[PDB]
Assembly symmetry: D2
Homo-oligomer: 291 residues x 4
């Protein structure tokens, strides 16, 4: 086999546009794999949401790592985890990376936002971000700490999101890429791809770029290919679909006080057993238990 | 407020047929609460499945307890946990109960099956179950250990499921109820309610009875009321609905390499924020952080 | 009388109180059997027993888990050194809630910037967290308690960070006005001069806790003369434990025998007693069939 | 050279080897610095440090977590006393896989029935797990290893449970034939007679590990004369640690002073060294902006 880390690294450096799909628990990870996706996106929003908490580092980094451990155990394709800012400074970030590596996770995506939120000024001006040298050094520490040379570090640049412009975005991307980032994730808050286009034009293909088209989803996918984008992340759609189904199913049963109107609309219990790989255990039990 | 334990206890002892809905993580727990359900069923099948593992005590009891801790943190109504056989003998069972009690879980359902599976004989005869006195004593230990007198212990009788008959079922139910069980969960493998009917007729209302109509779902709910059943558990439908939605959404995006055909079929990102109660944090940040 | 209340009464008592450091369930039980009315959950001791550095390497939930076993093993209150709350006010209050749920009696929070952001070690005074920011964190923790008697101790780092009496006084009054149950005043000196200066200037506005590790030759009655409320014996059990383990391990390594250690260590029977093994033997006799 | 391989070479070496008990990250590091080539992850020591009984009260994942910190803190192999694998063959192999992933080098499994099912303490010999069942558990563990050199030690309880040499021999051969890397032969006697009898009858079919705690006055060369492969110093660090903590805590309790302990315990500087604090100081200088 090919290591999961190697699988992800090849995807980031390939000449084709690659896609990874959001999963938020072991069950969704297996479903994503069975569908044919070559990679999984461990969404920070999805993992926190399934736990019932906010996407503001309320769950501890070890609790996040445990969710991902079950996800990694349930899939053969690489998982790239959204690790926010690394849960602290360079030291907390490299400790996280080593634990992820040991659990089979393929890479981690770190962002250059200030953590945690210390002020509440809600004006209309740009938001200060982590110092560029500090973040670049954080990326360097993670790369230096890896025991698997193919584990990936993706740097998420928050320049556009925070209200700054192309110049700030480019400076940060170049700095992180020079520090060893395996890819740059360029995001924006616009409902169109303009920030992405401006960046790809100025970037001059200095390294793989990852994008998240959630808000500009009507953009033709071939346009990303034309721009030389390396990977697209479908960020949170399984979580969103799960919520719609659970809200709908729950209301139906609540209203009917019966299962008649949901039984034919959901997978069978046997399909759950199949997704749990119950057959493999049945066989193991017949081989390892006395008759 | 009324303690969650008290809420569940009242439901088991009420004169009305009550209903609790399956939830398997913090997010589904909140959705179940928002729908109006007075209680939640922490399904052993659902919790293990969402983790990607089998429903054979592969996840440790503390890992199960952590999932339920997030569930309890995300709901105001009681959660009754399917705790299999208590993860060991009376001592492991009472330790589990105390930890559940401390995390806010309202009750636990324990079953009289042998644990773990030591043999593999796959004939067509009835399956040996835990010794009746041993299980009754286990129930007693849990009751004796409670620090909250309203925490509930539901005893699941496996007599029918294992191939024995009404007589064995009644003997076990009476024994567990005499040991202090707050309710008896009577289950069967039939696709009709015959075992349930035979039991309710012979039971002579010696205590609350809980049933799981998953396989005999076309039975009119009023029939359960006519039999004096105390509670109905809708066992695994949110999990089953979630899987259908995730499989469907994933395939669609996989096939289209676009989000156009799923965006209008799933809840919005803002609905996820609402379910995470992001607004409460925004307000807290404005009150507790310097401007 | 809850553990929280016990600790609150100690902080507000008219006598000098004492709490002994412990770092695991075993040592917490030993501190209790010795007669100490409270336990200090040392940040240095907990991280050291785990084998990591005292710089938030272990996650807050891993720390809470260590403390859970400690609380389960003791009947007297434990005051946890919670660093800066592991984040901003929201992380701090989530921590306080989990500690409350586990039976921990109080948390000590310090006003240092978190985490380390630069490595400049010139001679200047080290900047601390903003006073208003920390005061609000204390308030958020107090406002969040489900148990009115849970204690929040505010550790002032002014003297340590190189600032003067004016800063320490200023900080302490703000944290006390925000609701802190006590102020922990520390120094880097091998004499009690900073403490003496603070107590004189404080004018008994609230209970003061101190750690005399470095100025240990100062007579304890001197602290009583200054009106100090509580003394923390911060890390001697950890230090005694290391001395013992190093000596014992070396003896066995050199002798390739147990002959020279067997008579210098507690018997295996004492370990069983500390584990309350007889209690389980008695429970097994009651809850397991006699045959 | 992986830790697993190191342990395997020790079990199969031509010299008598020694492993020292440790129960947390700190003590594992101390055992390593002393020069020991291996560590014994004592079940009694791990449960005792947590403050619970040695009867699977702590969950297997909580035990694995303690061992994770131990493995992170040491470069030599750790052999974990894994009781009976925490369930049947499936629980055992899942445990082995998680231990492998954490860097643990081997697991010692015992053939006792689990868990306790009756409280009859007459005079008869205690029944053990079925020989075929346990042999198959060993095989399932061996078949499941991702690392060929991970070690499975089979602890035979025949002598302890009151059976004779014939039973011990019979069990050992079966577990050895199933693939066990070594046999741990234990006795309840204060003399080495059961071991002598077993070694004579064994005919060197495989490496044998022993625990001389109870017959500690027997000269070590005698074990070398019998062809014993490894000796386990089972619990002296835990015992030394309790002696130290009890004495230190009492001294401080009685004196209300540190004066009589300060010179008998290691300095705070030694704790920092053991924590590798300087290593972090150096990393901060490299990865944090100089200003």
């Amino acid at each position: 086999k090919v290591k999961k880390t190697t699988q992800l690294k090849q995807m980031l450096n390939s000449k084709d546009l690659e896609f990874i799909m959001e999963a938020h628990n072991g069950l969704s990870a297996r479903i994503v794999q069975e569908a044919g996706f070559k990679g999984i996106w461990g969404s920070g929003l999805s993992v926190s949401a399934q736990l019932g908490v906010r996407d503001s580092n309320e769950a501890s980094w070890t609790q996040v790592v445990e969710v991902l451990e079950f996800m990694s155990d349930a899939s053969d394709v690489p998982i790239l985890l959204d690790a926010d800012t690394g849960y602290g400074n360079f030291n907390n970030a490299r400790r996280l990376v080593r634990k992820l590596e040991d659990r089979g996770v393929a890479g981690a995506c770190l962002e250059d936002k200030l953590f945690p939120k210390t002020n509440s000024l809600h004006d209309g001006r740009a938001q200060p971000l982590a110092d560029i040298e500090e973040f670049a050094l954080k990326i360097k520490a993670c790369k230096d700490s890896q025991t698997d040379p193919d584990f990936c570090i993706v740097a998420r640049v928050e320049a556009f999101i925070a209200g700054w412009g192309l110049d700030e975005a480019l400076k940060r991307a170049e700095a992180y890429r020079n520090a060893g980032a395996d890819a740059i994730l360029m995001h924006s808050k616009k409902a169109d791809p303009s920030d992405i286009e401006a960046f790809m034009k100025a970037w001059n293909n200095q390294g793989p770029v990852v994008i998240v088209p959630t808000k500009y989803y009507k953009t033709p996918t071939d346009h990303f290919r034309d721009m030389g984008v390396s990977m697209v992340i479908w960020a949170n759609h399984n979580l969103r679909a799960s919520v719609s189904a659970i809200q709908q199913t729950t209301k139906q049963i609540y209203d009917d006080q019966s299962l008649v109107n949901v039984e034919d609309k959901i997978v069978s219990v046997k399909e759950i057993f199949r997704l749990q790989r119950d057959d493999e255990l049945v066989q193991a039990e017949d081989k390892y238990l006395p008759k």
